[PDB]
Amino acid sequence: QDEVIWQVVGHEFCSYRIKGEAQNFCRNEYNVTGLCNRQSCPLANSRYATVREDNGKLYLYMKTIERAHFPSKLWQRIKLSKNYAKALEQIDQQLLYWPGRQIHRCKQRLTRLTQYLLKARRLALKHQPALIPIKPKQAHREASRERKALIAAKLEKNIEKELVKRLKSGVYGDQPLNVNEEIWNKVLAARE
């Protein structure tokens, strides 16, 4: 069973395997470590235990060889207490007389899943900027429309037109301070 299963899934083809430069990974949901190993494989180990998170609660999933042929009833889970000390005790008492390597791996996953729930709660309380995706078509359109708008704006022509218009309207005092004698005299002869 297990040794034949491993020789197939572990060395020929597993749909859960992700090949990596230094270590292969397992996208199986029930893998405690997330790595492709002989001891980490949930497929090749008929007595397996893992800790998984379900909507904010952690559970200890266990399967035995005597339920291997019944996929619906294969895995059984118990709710792990929110007290970390008691959660370790529950793993110890549910995995009684299991190999210490497997209890070690479930206690490591319990810590990381407890840390992830802590960090998730801390991010919820914190305020962080929303990530706004950049849309290539919108960026192209607004870049070309802006170029046409800037050309059609005639900024320096409109700035100069407004400045002269308010010079004629005399928004300043009697004699302006932004003009010299020749400009003021020319303006006086024209506007009057």
Binding site: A152, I159, E162, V164, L177, N178
Partner: protein, 305 residues
Amino acid sequence: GKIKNKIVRQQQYMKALHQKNKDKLERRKERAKEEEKDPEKKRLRLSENIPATIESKRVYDETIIEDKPDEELQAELKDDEFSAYFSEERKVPKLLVTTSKRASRKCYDFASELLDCFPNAEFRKRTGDIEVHEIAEAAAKRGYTDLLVLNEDRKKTNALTLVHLPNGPSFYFTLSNLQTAKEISNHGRSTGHIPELIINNFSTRLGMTVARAFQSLFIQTPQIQGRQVVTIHCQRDFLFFRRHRYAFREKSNMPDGIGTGLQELGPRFTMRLRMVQKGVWDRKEGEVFFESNAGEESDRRKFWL
């Protein structure tokens, strides 16, 4: 189209294009002769055939403010959020320019230029995890009246949210074409004089709100002797911010015989109004006065500002 041969179909195109040019030329040459013979025909053609422009064919909206003064519009403004600036009280505007959390020196090189544009503006580095509403409510007790937050990411300022204190409207713009004085050809040095303000082309009612908000950032009385003018110009819903130093001189082309010369001081950039909120800015729980829809902006002739 009909011809799926590439060579033939471009031979046919060149033949038709040459035929089109010849008839257009003949019509133009004969039109010139008759209009020369009778100048009145040239007057009729010029008056009737005015070239179309996107401004002329802009889609109709009733929110445009008429040039005739309106008592309902003035009644709304006389007790508005910006009323303390446009009334006889003349509340001197005090600005608080800040940035986003953990900003780079590229943001400071543009913030310093924005600090030069606005006298009586203060810059405070953003520290820790203080939010915009917390800054606004804290700055409202320090005498400040407007808060400017420059959002930057990956060493590039791209957004600007301005909040009218203490509980005034909040505006959100996305910036582009950010250029500093050193990057502008034939730039200048800006002195400490209070710049003048020019606001153009904000016809719609939503434009009045944005034009008032930008007007409220400037000291009411400018220093004319400095000859510095700050322009915010809206064209096709794009707001262009320029600062120039002007000097009146004689231009022969202009009908009045007079026309100023400009020398840019910087910074220069463009803004697009993304959202206006009632009250202090809050992207989650804020009340949306105006939110730009990029689907509606696909019309070249439809504008909101």
